[PDB]
Amino acid sequence: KRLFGGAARHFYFEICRCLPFIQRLHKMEEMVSLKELRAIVKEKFKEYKDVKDGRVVDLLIFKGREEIETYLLMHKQRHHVVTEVVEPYYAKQRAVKKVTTNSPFLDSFLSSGYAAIGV
Amino acid sequence: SLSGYFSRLLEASGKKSVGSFFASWEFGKMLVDGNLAHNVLVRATGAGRLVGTDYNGNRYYENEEAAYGRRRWIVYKDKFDYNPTTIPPEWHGWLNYINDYNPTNTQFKQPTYQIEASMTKTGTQTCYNPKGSWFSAKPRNWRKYESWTP
Amino acid sequence: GYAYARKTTDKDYIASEHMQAFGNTQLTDYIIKTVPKFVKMAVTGPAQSSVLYQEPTIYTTPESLVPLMVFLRDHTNTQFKCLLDVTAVDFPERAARFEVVYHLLSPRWNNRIRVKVCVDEVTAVPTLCKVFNTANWFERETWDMFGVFFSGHPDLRRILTDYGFTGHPLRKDFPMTGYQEVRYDYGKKRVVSEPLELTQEFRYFDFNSPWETLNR
Amino acid sequence: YSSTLMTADKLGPGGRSSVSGITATVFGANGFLGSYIVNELAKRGSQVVCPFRSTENEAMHLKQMGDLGQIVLLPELDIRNDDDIKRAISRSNVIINCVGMRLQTKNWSFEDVHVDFPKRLAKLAAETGQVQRLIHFSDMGADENHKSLRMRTKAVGDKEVLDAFPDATIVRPGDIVGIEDHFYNYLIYQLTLTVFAPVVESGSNKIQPTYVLDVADAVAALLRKPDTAGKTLYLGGPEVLTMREVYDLLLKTLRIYRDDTVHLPAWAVKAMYKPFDSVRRMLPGLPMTSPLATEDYVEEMLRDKVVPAGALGYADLGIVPQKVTDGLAIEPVRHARVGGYRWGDMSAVAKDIPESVRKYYNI
Amino acid sequence: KARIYAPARTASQSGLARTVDFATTTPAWKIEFEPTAKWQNPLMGWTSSADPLENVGRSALV
Amino acid sequence: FKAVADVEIDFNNREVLKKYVGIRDHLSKEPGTRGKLIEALTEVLSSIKAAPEGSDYRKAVEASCIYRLKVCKENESDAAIEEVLDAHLEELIKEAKEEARLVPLIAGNAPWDVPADYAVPVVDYTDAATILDAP
Amino acid sequence: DKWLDGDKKSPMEYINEVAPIKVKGLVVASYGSDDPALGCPVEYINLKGTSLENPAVCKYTGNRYYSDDWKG
Amino acid sequence: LTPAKVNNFTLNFGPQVLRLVLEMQGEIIMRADPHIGLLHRGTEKLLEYKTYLQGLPYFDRLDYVSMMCMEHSYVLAIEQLLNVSVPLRGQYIRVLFSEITRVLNHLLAITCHSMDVGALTPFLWAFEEREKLFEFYERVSGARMHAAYFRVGGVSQDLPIGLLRDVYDWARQFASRLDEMEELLTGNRIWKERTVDVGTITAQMAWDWGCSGPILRASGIDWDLRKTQPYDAYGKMQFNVPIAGHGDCYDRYLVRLQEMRESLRIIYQCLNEMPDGLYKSPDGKVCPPSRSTMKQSMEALIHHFKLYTEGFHVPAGETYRAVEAPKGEFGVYLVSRGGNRPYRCKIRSPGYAHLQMTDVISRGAMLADVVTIIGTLDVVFGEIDR
Amino acid sequence: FEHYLPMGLEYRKFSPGTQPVKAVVPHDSPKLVYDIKYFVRDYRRNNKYTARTVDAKTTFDFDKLYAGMPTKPEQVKNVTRPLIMPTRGY
Amino acid sequence: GTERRPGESGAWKQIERQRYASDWENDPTFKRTPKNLAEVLDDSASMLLLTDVWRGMAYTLGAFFDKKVTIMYPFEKGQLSPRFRGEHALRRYPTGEERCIACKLCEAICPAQAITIEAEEREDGSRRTTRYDIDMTKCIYCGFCQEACPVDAIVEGPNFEFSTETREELLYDKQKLLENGDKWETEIATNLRTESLYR
Ligand SMILES: NC(=O)C1=CN([C@@H]2O[C@H](COP(=O)(O)OP(=O)(O)OC[C@H]3O[C@@H](n4cnc5c(N)ncnc54)[C@H](OP(=O)(O)O)[C@@H]3O)[C@@H](O)[C@H]2O)C=CC1
C-alpha cells in the first residue's frame, strides 16, 4: 500500500510514541512541547527522502533505533540535547528573516577564500 | 659517641657551633620539613664518609655498608630551596647509580661550550618560551613569504 | 568440552602422527569432498597454529555459513570448539568491499582454521550467536567499525565508538582523524563536539619506491 | 582601523586553531563578565592578555579558555602602577576594562577604581598609538546627578574616558544575569537563608535585566562594527519589569509558599544599613556581604533603570536579546530547585504534573 | 570535487613499478580532493588546517 | 600435569582423577563405559541413513564409525581405549551424540546437491626452502 | 639568525677558529672522532691541489685538511 | 519495537574506566550489562598509516601490564610472512624475558585482586619485586614499561654484562617472597569464603565463551600453547602445568601462583642454558645492521637509510599468530598487500573475551562479588578497547 | 628462607656504565664475512603460491586414511614436540 | 592450607548442595572427616580460636621489626642504566659544530610526528638546520630517533626531571635542545663510551 511497505512511517510512529518520556526525563518541559519535538523528528527524516533501496532504508531505521535507544538509556547527557535538539531549534526560529540582502555567492566571497565546511 | 655525632653534624650543616646551628633559621625550617630534618640529623650522621663537593657547595657521601639502592646520598647547600636540578651532570651518573665515576676519581673531558648546572626557572616569567610566544623579546610572524609594501 | 587433563606425566609430544598428517595435508581435501556446496574457494595458508605446517582458509556465501560452522564445530574429525574471533577487511576496489573473517581453534587436535565470507554493505550476515556465545560482541564490534549487519541478532548496537558517533572508523574511506573534535566551552558550561581543527596538520610521507616488485 | 582590526590578519574559519589576528588586554578578566568576554574573544582565535590581582587559584579557570600561547597571565597587577598597564597593552591594539567595585573599602574608594585608573589607562592607550579599540564598561543607572556615589563615579569616569580617548566605545548594560552573577545570587541569599527580605518603598521601579552571552556577542559585534567607536551603547532585555514583579517570578521559580519580602520606607532601610556603612572604611573588607545593604542601592531602587529612549542598543548590533525570564538562562537558577522533581510542598505546580498523578490526587 | 587519475612517473628515477605499466599488478588509480585553506601556527609556525579530507585519498584510496 | 591442592592425590585410580578434573560435576556424573559408546556409535550409524548413499559425507561418517567400533571391539580395558583415542570415554560419548545430532540439519540442507561440473578453485602455498635447502 | 637568538657564539664562529690540519698523503679519512663509531660516516677527501690557503673542508664535520705532497 | 514502561530498579556502577549497569531483584544480581569503549583509541586504523617498525610501540600500550608478550605475537606474525629464522640466543632471551613479564602480570593481577578483596600488604610487598624487574627492564632497554625491545628477526640490543647475575640473585629469593605472600591468604578462611565457589565456569561454557590462560586451566583443561603449539625455545623448556577442576576464584588464584612457580623454573632453566652467538637475524635487508657496520660500509649505510625511512616490504598475504599471554591467548591477524605498511592488522585480546562472561557469571551473585568477578577476570581495557 | 633487600656488594655491585670487562658483541656471521652472495639466501622473495587444479573429480579413499590409524594401546605413535624453531646455523 | 570445608563455600547452590548432598565427600580436596576425639579437638582448634589468622599476624608482626626499602628523595635517587631514554637533546662535535646535518632520518622514522625540521645550506656551504623542533608533549621517548641518527646527533639525555608549569615550555626548539646538549654532553659521552660496545 506504500513504498517498501512504509517502514519509515512505522519507525516515525514508534519514535513519536517514545518521545514524551524523553521530554519528561530530560526536563524539556520548559523548552519544548510534543508538537515541535515531533517536527524536529520529522525534519530528521527528510535527510534521506530520496533513497531508492529498501535495504538502505532498513539500515537507516536500525541505526535510528540505536540512536533513540541510547537516547532512552540516558547514555547521551543533557549536553547532547543542548547541542543537537533545542539550541538548533532556537537558532532556526531565531535567525528567521535575516536582513542581509547579498547573494549567497557574494556572502561566501565576503566570508573567506574557501567555502565553510562542517557544523 | 656524642662528640663525633656533633662533629659530623657541624661538618654537614655547614655552621660553626651548635649554638650557631640550633639558633639558625635553617634549624627552624628543619622543625617543619621532615625530609630536610631527616637529611640533616639521621642519614648524614650515620656511619659513612664524605666523597666530594661540587661547585654549588653540595656534599656527596657514600656508605658501602648500606643495602643496595641506598648507599649514596647528597646534602643540598640551599637549605630553604633545595632542588635536584642544581646537581652537576658529572655527579648525576654516580648519584643515579648509572656509573661508578665521580670527579674525585675520574677526570672527564670538559668542552669549552659546556654550560653549568643551576636551578630550574619553571613557573617564572624568565623561563624559556617559544619564538612565537608573547613573552619573546621580538614576536615572530612565521609567514613563509614577503608581503608587498607600497 | 574437551582437552581434559588425562595424563599425569609430562607430554613430550604434540598430537598423533596420523591425525596430524591428515590435518596438515588432506584436511582441505576432506573439507572439499564433504560439503562442496559449502565450499566456494580454497586456500591453504601459513598455518596460524605453527610456523612449520599448512592450514586451510574457507570462502563461501553467507547463505550456508551457519550450517558450515555447525559442521565445523560438531564434526567428529573437525572439533573446532573454539571460535577465536570474527572480523572483516575492506576491499574498496571490489564489487563487494567486505571480507568477513572467522577463526576457529580445535583443542581436540591442536589445529586451527580460517573462514571468510565476502559481502557488500547492504547484505545481511546471519548471526553465529546460536553457534558461539562470543560472536555477540565480535559482531557488535564489526558492525561498529564497518557497518556489517548481522540478521537475527538479539541486540546489535555500537560498542566502541562514542555514544552519538555516526560512521565506521575502520573503513578505508573514513578519515584518519575524522570530522569532529570535542572541547569544553565555559559559556555553555558543556563539553561540545566541534569541527575538527589542527594546530599542525598531519604529514603523509611517500616512501614507496618506483622500483619495488612486491607491490600488489 | 575601521575594519582592518577584524579582517587583516584573520586566518582560518574562526575556530580554536584559527587566528583572528586580534590582540587585546582585558582588565577584570577573572570577574563575572570579563571571564565570558575573554572566553568569547579567544574562542574566535584571538590573543588575550589577562592581568589579575586575585589568586592564581581563582584565575586558573581562564587558562583553559585559550590555546597554547594565547592566554597571557600577568600576576600581581597594581592599578596604581602604570608600568604593569603599559606592559599589558604593549602589543594589544584593543583594550577592554571590566574592573568594577560595588562596595567601598579602606584601601580602595569609588573614585580610585572608577575615575583615576580608567583615565590613566585611556591616557596610556592614546600614548601607545597602535590601539584601535578601547572598550569601557559602566552601569545603565550611571548618571552624574544621582545620589548614589558609585553611579556618579561611573558617569564621571565615562566622561573622563570619552574626553581622553575620543574613539573609545562606552557600554552601559543593566542587570546582567548568569550562573555567578551579582543580581540573582544575592536575591536568593536574601529570599533564603534569611528571616525577612526588605524591599525599598513600593519597589515598582522598572529595570531591564539582560543576559551575559548577549553581552559577549555584543562585544564581538562592537569589534565588528566600526561606527560604534566613540559612542555609547546601552544593553537591556526585551521586557520591562518592576522589582515586585521580579520578586514574584523568583518566588514562583523557587516555588516558595511564604512571601518573606516587606515594603519599607527608604529612611528605615538606610537606618538599617547606616551602622555598617559608617564602618565600611578602616576595614579590609568582609566576605558574604551582599552589595544590597547600602544606601546607594536604596537610591537605585527609587529610580527606574532601563534603556533610554533613542539609545544605542542590541538592535543596532543586529542582536535579538534572548529571554531572561525563561529559557536556558533560567536553568541555572532552576538548579536551586533542581528544576523540580519532588522539592517543596507546592500544589499550584499541579499544572505541569503528569496526567495519571493528578487523577491519582483528583484535581 | 574529486580527481580520478594515476600519478605520472617521477623524473627523478627510471623506476616504472608504481606506474600504469604494471596496471593489472597493483592498484594504481588515485582519488584526490581540492586542497583547502592552510596557515601557520603563531607560536611555532607549523602548518595549520581544518580539512577533513586532507590525506585520506592519497594514502588509502587505490 | 600438576595438581593444585597442597594435599597428596594418588591419581593412579582413574575415578579419583575423574573427580579431581570435575568430569563428574561439569560433563558427566555417570561413568562412561564401552557399551555406552557402542550404543552411541550404533545410533550414529542408524541416524546417518537419512543421507543418500551417493554422498561422500555419509561415506566418511561411516568410515569413522567403523574405525571407532573396531577400536571398541579389539580393546577390553577402557583405559586402553583412552590411550588409543587420546581422551576419556565420556568425551567420546559426547562426540558420538554430537555427530548423530549433526545429521538432521545436514539432511535438511543437503550440500551434495551440486551440478556434475561443479568447480572448486584450489590454491596451494609453496615454501621458499623447498627450492633453497638441500633437496 | 633564523633559529639562534642573541649575540651568543654561533657554530660558524666556533669552526672558523680551528686552523686547517696538515696530513701526509693524497686522500684523508674523516670520522669525526678518534673512535670511528662515535662520529660520522667515514669520508675520503681529496688533498691534491690543496694548501693552507686553500684546503679541503670536511663535508661532515667542517674540519679542514691539506697536504704538501702534490709536488708543492 | 520496545517501550520502557516499567522503570522500577535502576543502577549506575561507576564512570570511574569501566561502566557497569546491573539488574537486581534485591540483593542478588540478575543482569549485568557492561559498557565499554571509554579507552577505544582506534589504534587499528592508526596502524595503517605507520610502518611495521613505526607501529611497534602501539603494541607496547595494548597491555601495559605485559608488554613483551604483546610485541612477540606481532613480531612472529611479521616474520612468518617474511620467512625469517630467529637465532638461538635471541629465542632464549625472548623466552626468559617473556617469563619475567608473565611473572609481573601475575604479581600485579593477584595484588590488585587482593586489594579489591581487602588485603593491602601483598600489594605493597610484591610491588618491590615488580620494581626489581622494572630495573631489569630498564637495564636492557632503557624503558621501565614500554621497552620496544623485540624486533623482527631478534632484539634491539644484546643483554648487558652482569645482568644474569642479578637475575639469578633475584630468583634466589623470589620463592621466599612468594611463600610469605601465600601465607596471608592461602590458609585464611576469610579469603576462601570470599573466593570459594564464586563465579563457577565449566569447560563446555569456557570453550563456548572462548576462555584462555589460567581460567581455562582451572576447569580441568589440559592446554598450554607453549606445549601444544610451541614457539621459539619453549619446546626445549621442561615445566609442569597446574590443573584445577572447580572453576573457582580460589582455584584461579592457586593456578596463577603455580604458574608463577613454573615461570620461575623456566627462568632458572633459561639462565643455565644461555648460549653465545648472534642475537639478530643475519638478513640486513630486513634487520638493521650495526652502527659500526653502518659507519664503515656503503651497503649497510644504504640499508639503514632505506629501512629507517621506508622499511622492508612484506609480501602480499595473510596470517594470524597467537601467543600464550599471561591474561590468555593474545593474537594478531595480519593482512599484507605487498607494501611497507600492513594493510589490515586486527588484534585479538583474551580479556575482551573474558569480559563478555560477566552477565552469565554474575547471575545469582551479590554486589560484593562483582568486584571479585572483575578482579579474577584479570582484564586490561587497553587490549579490550583498542 | 631467603631475605629480601641484600646488603652492599651482594646485588648489582657494578653500575652498568662501569663494567670491569670490555664487551665484544659479534655483529656478523663468520661464515658470511667474505662470502656475501644473497640469492642463495633470499627466502623472502622466493616463496610461491600456486593455483592447483579444480578439485572436483577427485577420489578421496577414506579407507587409506583409516588404515593408517592404530588399533591397540601399543602401535601408537606420537609426534614429538620440537625443541626450537629453525635457526639455519645462527 | 588449601583444603575445603562444608559451610565455607561463599555461595548458596554449593552450600545448599553440600548440606543436602554428600558430594563433597567424594572430592579428595575436601578435608576428610575426623574419626576420634583427638581429630575432633583438632578441628575445633582449627575453627575456633582462629589459628589461621595467627600465622599471618605473626608474619606481619615480624615484618614490623623488619627492615625497609624506602628511599629519601630528592636526597636519594634510584638506579638507572646508560640505555635510559629521557629528554631528547642535540649534540655537537668537540670543536663546537652541530652534529645534526639535517638528513631528516629522525623526522622520517618518528612515528609520533613530533619532529618538525626545516633546513638549507649555511653561508659557508654547510648543510645545517634552520628549524629543529620536537614536541615533548607529543614525543613518546621511544628512542627510535636515537637509533636512526647515524652521526649521534639526537640523543635522549639522562635528564628526566624536566616537568613544567605550562605546556608551552615543553615545545622544544633548536636553541633549547642545543642548550640541553651543551649541559649534558659529558654524561651522554660517558654513556656512549659504554653503549658503543652494544650499539
Ligand atoms: N549586572 C552587572 O554585573 C553589571 C556590571 N557592570 C560592570 O561589569 C563589570 C563586571 O561586572 P561583575 O564582573 O559582575 O562584577 P565582579 O565584581 O564580578 O568583577 C569584579 C572584577 O573587578 C576586579 N577589581 C575591582 N576592583 C579592583 C581593583 N581595585 N584592583 C584590581 N582588580 C579590581 C576584581 O578583581 P578581584 O577578583 O581581585 O576583586 C574582579 O575581577 C564591573 O566593572 C561592573 O561595573 C555594569 C553594569 C551592571
Ligand code: SF4
Ligand atoms: S638529528 Fe640526526 S637523524 Fe635527525 S636530521 Fe639531524 S643528523 Fe639527521
Ligand code: SF4
Ligand atoms: S624518542 Fe621517539 S618520539 Fe621522541 S623524538 Fe625520538 S623518535 Fe620521536
